[PDB]
A paper describes a structure:
To investigate whether the conformations of SurA bound to BAM observed above are altered when BAM adopts a Lateral Closed state, the bactericidal compound, darobactin-B (DAR-B)40,41 was added to the POTRA-1 cross-linked SurA sample and the structure determined by cryoEM. As expected, therefore, addition of DAR-B yielded BAM in a Lateral Closed conformation, wherein DAR-B is bound to β-strand 1 of BamA’s β-barrel. Hence, the two SurA conformations we observe (and their relative proportions) do not change when BAM is DAR-B bound, despite BAM itself undergoing a major, multi-domain rearrangement. The addition of DAR-B to BAM traps BamA in the Lateral Closed state, decreasing flexibility of the barrel. This increased rigidity is observed in our structure, and allowed the resolution of the complex to extend beyond 3Å, enabling better visualisation of SurA in its BAM-bound state. Interestingly, the addition of DAR-B to this sample (2-fold molar excess) yielded ~ 25% of particles in a Lateral Open conformation, whereas no Lateral Open particles were observed in the presence of the same concentration of DAR-B when SurA is absent. This suggests that the presence of SurA may shift the equilibrium between the Lateral Open and Lateral Closed conformations of BAM towards the open state.
The outer membrane is a formidable barrier that protects Gram-negative bacteria against environmental threats. Its integrity requires the correct folding and insertion of outer membrane proteins (OMPs) by the membrane-embedded β-barrel assembly machinery (BAM). BamA is composed of a 16-stranded β-barrel, which, in E. coli, is preceded N-terminally by five polypeptide transport associated (POTRA) domains that extend into the periplasm. Unfolded OMPs are delivered to BAM by the periplasmic chaperone SurA, but how SurA and BAM work together to ensure successful OMP delivery and folding remains unclear. The results suggest that SurA binds BAM at its soluble POTRA-1 domain, which may trigger conformational changes in both BAM and SurA that enable transfer of the unfolded OMP to the BAM lateral gate for insertion into the outer membrane.
Numbering used by the authors:
A (entry chain B): 26 to 392
B (entry chain F): 25 to 53, 58 to 103, 123 to 161, 164 to 168, 170 to 206, 212 to 273, 395 to 428
C (entry chain A): 27 to 809
D (entry chain D): 26 to 242
E (entry chain C): 32 to 87
F (entry chain I): 1 to 7
G (entry chain E): 28 to 111
Write the structure that this text describes.
């Protein structure tokens, strides 16, 4: 069995610089082939990486030395082992490390030592990023419930049920917060904004042109984190439309025939995204006019793009990091980073580009 | 004496119509380049018109005659002229019908009430050259497209607006008439910020292609923004229909 | 003036004439010819046309659309070619008409559609249009089917009581399939998911969770459409009790017996299996009373306060239906009697749903049919008469088996054969089989009629030829070439039981016999007095044996049993008029007692008894002696090493070589009897084995049940009651059963892709002289 | 493999193969001609040749499909009697589908639904076309099919006598006397019904069956 | 598998003779859905009939 | 290993 | 050994008591159901046979003969509770 197309040949380009790994720190079995949103974070100078087995390491961002390490797995005797199944990406905002798990448990650990500050059972697999906002931790469970939990107490403040299709795509849209309004992408194509206090429905708008095929192929999931810029919410469904909508009313500002489940950057007057066909597209914000398109990485299983030193960075399921130019989209640089591959999104914070591979070995890149 | 240039969908573009419209633009023209490039551009334009015609002559109804007569009287073989005007006013109507559904206009900040917006100072007479690109112009399309665009901007305009353009105004020369600041695509706004009498604007990266502008002359905002969104969306959707069609070139 | 076409090779000329307004004797100008060509392409008759300039009148060139003459499919590994040819047919383009290039992409997406439906969410297709003269083209679609969408993980949410691995172990959908284990496939199906949801519900209702509910079932695709994640978001309740059971509805006067079925002890955990068994018991009771469709709805009234369950068993005994006639459809090979003798529901009797289900299950157990469906059609013009029509899909019943295995007991076992289990559709099973061990070469030809009597008595004959090399079996060297026939009647006296009784003639040819005390004692007692020299001896016997047997099989599971007992008492006594005059009784037993409700911990009591002696004036043949040791009898010992040891006489071997000693050869320097360590077996054996089966310690619980770990302790002693302890006093008394060898060890069993692998490491802590203590025993796929 | 030759030569070659006795080439040529030129000249003769070749090549299911296509496409045809007779022949060939060889098994107690279909087809043919050239051949085949169906019901009755299902035996022989009153199998099954009545101690009907046997022995 | 059915060599079936109802009783009604019509013709049987499809 | 093939 | 051999109608032993002379065929056919065996030779002589042969227990048969007339009205009830 061979894929639909031979995975796009490695685009040979002359790198304008020498991309190197500043430091490498392995994490045991690193989530693995399993699809997850689990990616490192960075609060001030500490990289908080996690693992599917339940191993969470806080490392020094400058040199990759273990500040501390904790195991969240709950073994029972010597008959069965229970890995924590961490899937929610690490989010560290208020001095706590928030990690979701597929056991419907969200853990807040202390950045000081790694002890479990609290742990709360939620509706389903916390596949989304446990975003932190307004003293609340918002997660989007795989069951379809958007749950907001107390930042310190840990008890669920509220839970809002979202419609779930018969079939969906792995992963849930991490909430985005703006002006006390939380915007999430339901798996049925409905982008939904609710309040940040008890979560009553502000509005819900369908953004997916899908369901026309009437099959199990045109899944209309919105698995990307919406981005709020200038009071406009940009969302990107799967097999749907890249839609800019009014935050207050929910009416569509504009729409493009683009579908993806990868997070996109919205900065200045530009939106950079990776298509469902792993096609790197940059569009305008005013009307969504596609400024440029890169199909040389077609069907290469790219990760969510990030902006590092004014240069887009994209992974792939081969351990290759492609530095794509911001302006014309031409491949500025290309680095062979790992052999297992890249699935989770990188993070570009504090001048550091951090990325986990499919074996979890955390790498810091310098441009 | 009447061959076929190409087949598109179930329709076919002939050689009689290609040569007839070439003679029409010849009589209209302005100076024009070598007739071979005009041949290729004319078959390209007729393929462009026929593919969108298939979208509308099987679904959309047909224009009336007396409103057509009023339009032509307001502004050779009479039968052929009436055939061409019936050929074009229906395609403009169906293009508008599709583009209106591909565009949304809110009474909110989409209306851009906050009417002055960016300064809208004076109407501008500007010309447009477009370099068509495939929905996936990566591999080498953009690379050669860049080379052609640099050659065009270095050379400049009467030749090139017909040579390798893609909009319906390719044969006319990209003329847009009077145009205000907000009645232009968003990519063109920054070029307009650097625009000047007789200035040549370099190619602008876009999914539609590379756009070259040259300024020739130096509820109200609803029509301005509608014009700019219509330009962007029509330019996009023409490329989408070009990619989503079966076109073959017949050397014969 | 006059149109002259040049094409129209395939399309009729009249179609072009009617599709082209300008014709012979018509006005000619550019506008008209343009209109005619536009209307000609309007119908799509011709792919390309042209008008060629000619001084004489008008000329027309025509190129019709290239007709497809054949459809070629390549690379469609996951689906049959004509399945996609039906897709091409349904689109509207097929062989016999033209090919449309526009329709090609629709074809491509159509093939994507059924690859999506079958489970290949990524399967690209490329069209290849090979030209052919006379305006023809052959499509050669290159299929490139991506990686199949396998289940990456099955997750359960809210299963605080039971681990996810334990619940998924019973699922037929598998997220982990180890290379060394056969636990299924990772392919995902809707029906499989529904069946596993029902399995999860059954598992939770069997543990007392009456309030268990599956809140939702999320099926998600990895964005690459290669991995499938199943999240069964459940809400388990508490471990409820069973306070009482009540029955209602029209019990039709059998209220007393139905209540007699519904005894429960209070304070016992709710069990969905027990509830369903009670419902089926009431159904069977009413069906035995003549009710065809005894509807039974056992609704639970759940007291959350006291956390108890009260079962309201509403019973509605429907009208009595009678089977006018039982009809069999699709039995083109098997005759009607073969299918009808497996029916428990009888034509002309009152219809019984349980009886019909039993008949369908028996037909499925025959193995002659791919699938067996039952339809209880209503007889027209009769309110309570039905026809129980059975639709069977006949199988290619004949098959040839090709097994290869390895083990310490028998070395390399090459098994082969061919058997037609439905010979001429008469129900007879004919079959030739063959086995080649390191020491035994068996060739069998068995023909059996499963129903020699309508009651179910089978009659089977068997022509067998066994070449047994005793030296290779870790015994005293002798080659026994036996051949004969058996005719055995099997009596199914009761279910879980089967007697058998038959007559068998066997001719044994013994050669290369090692001179030894036991074999020579037998030969002397058989009336022959040949010399102790001449290693290559020869003996021939023709012996007729009445064989009897009784097999009690209550094992709930055929593979890896957890509860029940399997006893096999097989005796063989020589009828008068045979060269040998002896009887030999053997008794196997394997009882499985589950000591836990989950049946993970099992106690296995395995016994292996045997006693045989002559009937006066004769002794038991030395080749019929029992053996112990090796795998499956006494682990930790060498194959057939437990028992009396051969006492070789001073004799001259056929071949001699220094430093080999040739088992006490005269050339080596032997003049007196010697104690040899090569075992010969004994006329009696007694073996017992206590085997504590535990869940595999270090393994994922998803396939823990697929690997049986056991701690075994085997006692076993083989003795020869005819041993002459008087004139053989220096040697150990081989007629002493008190020398009970014992071994203790650990064992692993699992169905690897190489067959059933059984490994074991055992230390014999109480072994005697001459017992080869083979610590490690194993057997790779004996099947 | 058949080249795309004009229909006349391909049809002539297929016919020559048909009298030559070599079938598979004839089927291939006929199906190639039919597929290349659907509903062309003398297409009905091509369909008849295809049906005959499929029947003679032991390819019964495709013969049935082709016959159904012909009968639904030509409800009023000059050679409709021929195609119904071919359908009956195909059904009868499905009846005697021995897995290995046609031996003393006689296939009487095998699946009779193909025999029932063949009997219905030939009955329709003879009732609708009593003057066709296949009329008396179809009548003889109906006689044989009636004998075979009654033999199947007799085998069922014999098995039920062995089992002791005397009610089933009585019902089966009553079904014989109704549907198949003039068959040797019915004459053989009458003693079975008498035995079933006697074993049930209903001598009031056993005597009637004995009288019937005596009057017809 | 069905080649021998090309020549089934039938016609050995005994002629169908209706049973006679003895005095005092009548045989059950035939309901002749399996009845043989009296239709007859030349129709040379025993492979003498040409099953070759008649071209028109 | 054990192989069996349905012919 | 041999399985359960059930044959004929299941006489409840209480439905048969409800049968009295003068009832039409419809009423009895409602009370006990259509008999498995009729009299195909003679008149409407319905035979309701409740026959049971268990697994080596001994065959027990209850015969119930209902002799009607041409008119369709019951005339005679020949009940044999056991196999003679
Ligand atoms: Mg999702």
């Amino acid at each position: 069995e061979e894929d639909v197309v031979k995975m796009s040949p490695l685009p040979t380009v002359e790198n304008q610089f020498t991309p190197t790994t500043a430091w490498s720190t392995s994490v045991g079995s690193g989530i693995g082939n399993f699809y997850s949103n689990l990616h490192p974070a960075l609060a001030d100078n500490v990289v908080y990486a996690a693992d599917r087995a339940g191993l969470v390491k806080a490392l020094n961002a400058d040199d990759g030395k273990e500040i501390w390490s904790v195991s969240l797995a709950e073994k029972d005797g010597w008959f069965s082992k229970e890995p924590a199944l961490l899937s929610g990406g690490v989010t560290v905002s208020g001095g706590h490390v928030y990690i979701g798990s597929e056991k419907a448990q969200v853990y807040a650990l202390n950045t000081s030592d790694g002890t479990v500050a609290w742990q709360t059972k939620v509706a389903g697999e916390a596949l989304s990023r446990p975003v932190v906002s307004d003293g609340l931790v918002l997660i989007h469970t795989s069951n379809g419930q958007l749950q907001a939990l107390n930042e310190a107490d840990g008890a669920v403040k509220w839970t809002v049920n979202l419609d779930m299709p018969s079939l969906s795509l792995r992963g849930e849209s991490a909430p985005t917060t703006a002006f006390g309004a939380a915007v999430v992408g339901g798996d049925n194509g409905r982008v939904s904004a609710v309040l940040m206090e008890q979560g009553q429905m502000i509005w819900q708008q369908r953004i997916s042109q899908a369901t026309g095929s009437t099959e199990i192929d045109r899944l209309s999931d919105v698995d990307t984190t919406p981005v709020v810029v200038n009071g406009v919410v940009f969302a990107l469904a799967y097999n749907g439309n890249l839609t800019a909508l009014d935050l207050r009313s929910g009416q569509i500002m504009w729409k493009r025939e683009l579908g993806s489940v990868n997070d996109f950057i919205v900065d200045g007057n530009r939106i950079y995204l990776v298509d469902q066909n792993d096609r790197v597209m940059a569009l305008t914000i005013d009307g969504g006019v596609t400024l440029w398109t890169q199909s040389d990485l077609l069907h290469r299983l790219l990760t969510s793009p990030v902006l590092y030193n004014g240069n887009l960075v994209v992974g792939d399921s081969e351990g290759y990091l492609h530095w794509i130019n911001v302006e014309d989209g031409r491949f500025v640089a290309q680095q062979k980073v790992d052999s297992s591959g890249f699935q989770t999104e990188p993070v570009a914070a504090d001048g550091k580009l951090l990325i986990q591979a499919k074996d979890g070995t955390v790498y810091s890149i310098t441009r | 004496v009447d061959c076929v240039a190409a087949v598109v969908n179930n329709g076919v573009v002939l050689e009689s119509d290609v040569d007839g419209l070439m003679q029409s633009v010849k009589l209209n023209a302005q100076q024009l380049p070598d007739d071979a490039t005009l041949r290729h551009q004319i078959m390209e334009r007729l393929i462009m018109d026929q593919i969108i015609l298939q979208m509308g002559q099987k679904m959309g109804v047909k224009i009336s005659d007396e409103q057509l007569d009023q339009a032509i009287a307001n502004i050779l073989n009479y039968n052929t002229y009436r055939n061409q005007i019936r050929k074009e006013m229906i395609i403009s109507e169906v293009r508008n019908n599709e583009v209106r559904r591909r565009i949304t206009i809110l009474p909110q900040e989409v209306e851009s009430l906050a009417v002055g917006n960016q300064n809208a100072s004076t109407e501008l007479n500007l010309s447009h050259i477009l370099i068509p690109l495939p929905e996936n112009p990566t591999s080498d399309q953009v690379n050669e497209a860049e080379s052609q665009a640099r050659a065009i901007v270095d050379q400049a305009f009467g030749k090139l607006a017909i040579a390798h353009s893609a909009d319906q105004q390719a044969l006319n020369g990209g003329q847009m008439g009077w145009g205000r600041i907000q009645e232009l695509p968003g990519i063109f706004a920054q070029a307009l910020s650097t625009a000047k009498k007789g200035d040549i604007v370099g190619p602008i990266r876009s999914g539609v292609g590379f756009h070259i502008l040259k300024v020739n002359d130096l509820d109200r905002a609803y029509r301005m923004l509608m014009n700019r969104k219509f330009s962007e969306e029509a330019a996009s959707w023409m490329q989408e229909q070009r990619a989503s069609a079966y076109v073959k070139i017949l050397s014969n | 003036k006059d149109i002259h076409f040049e094409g129209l090779q395939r399309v009729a000329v009249g179609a072009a004439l009617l599709s082209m307004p300008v014709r012979t004797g018509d006005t000619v100008n550019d506008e008209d010819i343009s209109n005619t060509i536009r209307a000609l392409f309007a119908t799509g008759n011709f792919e390309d046309v042209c008008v060629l300039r000619d001084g004489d009148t008008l000329l027309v060139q025509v190129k019709e659309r290239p007709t497809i003459a054949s459809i070629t499919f390549s690379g469609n590994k996951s689906v049959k070619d004509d399945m996609l040819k039906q897709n091409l047919e349904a689109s509207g383009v097929r062989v016999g008409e033209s090919l449309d290039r526009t329709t090609i992409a629709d074809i491509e997406k159509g093939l994507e559609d059924f690859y999506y439906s079958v489970g290949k969410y990524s399967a690209s297709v490329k069209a290849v249009v090979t030209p052919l003269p006379r305006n023809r083209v052959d499509l050669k679609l290159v299929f490139q089917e991506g990686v199949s969408a396998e289940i990456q993980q099955i997750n359960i949410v809210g299963n605080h009581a039971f681990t996810t691995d334990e619940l998924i172990s019973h699922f037929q959908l598998r997220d982990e399939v180890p290379w060394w284990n056969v636990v299924g496939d990772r392919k995902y199906q809707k029906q499989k998911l529904a069946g596993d949801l029902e399995t999860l519900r059954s598992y939770y209702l069997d543990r007392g969770y009456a309030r268990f509910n599956i809140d939702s079932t999320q099926v998600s695709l990895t964005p690459d459409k290669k991995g499938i994640y199943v999240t069964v978001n459940i809400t388990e309740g508490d471990q409820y009790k069973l306070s009482g059971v009540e029955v209602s509805g029209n019990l039709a006067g059998h209220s007393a017996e139905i209540e007699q079925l519904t005894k429960i002890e209070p304070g016992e955990l709710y069990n969905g299996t027990k509830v369903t068994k009670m419902e089926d018991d009431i159904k069977k009771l009413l069906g035995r009373y003549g009710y065809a469709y005894p509807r039974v709805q056992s609704m639970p009234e759940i007291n959350d306060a006291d956390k108890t369950v009260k079962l309201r068993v509403n019973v509605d005994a429907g009208n009595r239906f009678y089977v006018r006639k039982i009809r069999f459809e699709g039995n083109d090979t098997s005759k009607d009697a073969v299918l009808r003798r497996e029916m428990r529901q009888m034509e002309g009797a009152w219809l019984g749903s349980d009886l019909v289900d039993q008949g369908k299950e028996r037909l499925n157990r025959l193995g002659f049919f791919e699938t067996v469906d039952t339809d209880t059609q209503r007889v027209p013009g009769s309110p309570d008469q039905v026809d129980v029509v059975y639709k069977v899909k006949e199988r290619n019943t004949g098959s040839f088996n090709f097994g290869i295995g390895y083990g310490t007991e028998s070395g390399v076992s090459f098994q082969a054969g061919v058997q037609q289990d439905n010979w001429l559709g008469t129900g007879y099973a004919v079959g030739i089989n063959g086995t080649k061990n390191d020491y035994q070469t068996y060739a069998e030809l068995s023909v059996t009629n499963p129903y020699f009597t309508v009651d179910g008595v089978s009659l089977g004959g068997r022509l067998f030829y066994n070449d047994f090399q005793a030296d290779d079996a870790d015994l005293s060297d002798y080659t026994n070439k036996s051949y004969g026939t058996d005719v055995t009647l099997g009596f199914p006296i009761n279910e879980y039981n089967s007697l058998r009784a038959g007559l068998g003639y066997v001719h044994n040819s013994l050669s290369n016999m090692q001179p030894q005390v036991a074999m020579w004692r037998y030969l002397y007692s058989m009336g022959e007095h040949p010399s102790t020299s001449d290693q290559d001896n020869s003996f021939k016997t023709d012996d007729f044996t009445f064989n009897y047997g009784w097999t009690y099989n209550k094992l709930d599971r055929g593979y890896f049993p957890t509860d029940g007992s399997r006893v096999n008492l097989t005796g063989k006594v020589t009828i008068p008029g045979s060269d040998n005059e002896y009887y030999k009784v053997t008794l196997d037993t394997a009882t499985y007692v589950p000591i836990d409700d989950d049946h993970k911990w099992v106690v296995l009591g395995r016994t292996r008894w045997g006693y045989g002696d002559g009937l006066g004036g004769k002794e038991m043949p030395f080749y019929e002696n029992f053996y112990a040791g090796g795998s499956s009898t006494v682990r930790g010992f060498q194959s057939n090493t437990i028992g009396p040891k051969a006492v070789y006489f001073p004799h001259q071997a056929s071949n001699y070589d220094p430093d080999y000693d040739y088992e006490c050869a005269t050339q080596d320097g032997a003049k007196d009897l010697c104690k040899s360590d090569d075992a010969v077996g004994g006329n009696a054996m007694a073996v017992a084995s206590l085997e504590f089966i535990t869940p595999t310690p270090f393994i994922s619980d998803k396939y823990a049940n697929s690997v049986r770990t056991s701690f075994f302790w085997d006692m076993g002693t083989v003795w020869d009651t005819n041993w002459d302890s008087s004139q053989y006093s220096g040697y150990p008394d081989y007629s002493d059963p008190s020398n009970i060898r014992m071994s203790a060890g650990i064992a692993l069993q699992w169905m690897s892709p190489l067959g059933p692998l059984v490994f074991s490491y055992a230390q014999p802590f109480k072994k005697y002289d001459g017992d080869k203590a083979e610590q490690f025993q194993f057997n790779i796929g004996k099947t | 493999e058949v080249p795309d030759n004009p229909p006349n030569e391909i049809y002539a070659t297929a016919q020559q193969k048909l009298q030559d006795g070599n079938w598979r080439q004839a089927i291939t040529q006929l199906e190639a001609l039919d597929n290349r030129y659907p509903f062309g000249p003398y297409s009905q003769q091509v369909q008849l040749d295809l049906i005959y070749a499929y029947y003679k090549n032991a390819d019964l299911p495709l013969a049935q499909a082709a016959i159904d296509r012909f009968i639904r496409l030509n409800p009023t045809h000059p050679n409709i009697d021929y195609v119904m007779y071919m359908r009956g022949l195909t059904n009868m060939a499905l009846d005697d589908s021995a897995l290995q060889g046609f031996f003393g098994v006689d296939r009487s107690d095998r699946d009779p639904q193909h025999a029932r279909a063949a009997f219905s087809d030939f009955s329709k043919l003879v009732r609708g076309y009593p003057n066709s050239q296949y009329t008396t051949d179809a009548t003889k085949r109906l006689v044989f099919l009636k004998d075979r169906l009654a033999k199947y019901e007799y085998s069922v009755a014999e098995y039920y006598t062995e089992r002791g299902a005397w009610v089933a035996v009585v019902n089966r022989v009553e079904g014989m006397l109704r549907d198949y009153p003039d068959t040797q199998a019915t004459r053989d099954a009458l003693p079975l019904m008498e035995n079933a009545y006697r074993q049930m101690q209903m001598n009031a009907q056993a005597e009637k069956v004995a009288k019937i046997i005596a009057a017809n022995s | 598998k069905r080649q021998v059915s090309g020549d089934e060599a039938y016609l050995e079936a005994a002629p169908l003779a209706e049973l006679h109802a003895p005095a005092g009783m009548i045989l059950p009604v035939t309901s002749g859905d399996y009845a043989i019509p009296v239709t007859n013709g030349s129709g040379a049987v025993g492979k003498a009939l040409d099953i070759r499809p008649p071209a028109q | 290993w054990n192989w069996t093939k349905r012919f | 050994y041999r399985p359960d051999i059930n044959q004929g109608n299941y006489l409840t032993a209480n439905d048969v008591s409800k049968i009295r002379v003068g009832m039409t065929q419809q009423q009895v056919a409602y009370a006990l159901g259509t008999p498995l065996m009729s009299d195909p030779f003679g008149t409407n002589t319905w035979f309701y046979v409740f026959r049971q042969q268990p697994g080596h227990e001994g065959v027990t048969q209850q015969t119930l003969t209902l002799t009607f007339n041409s008119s369709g009205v019951l005339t005679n009830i020949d009940n044999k509770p056991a196999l003679s």
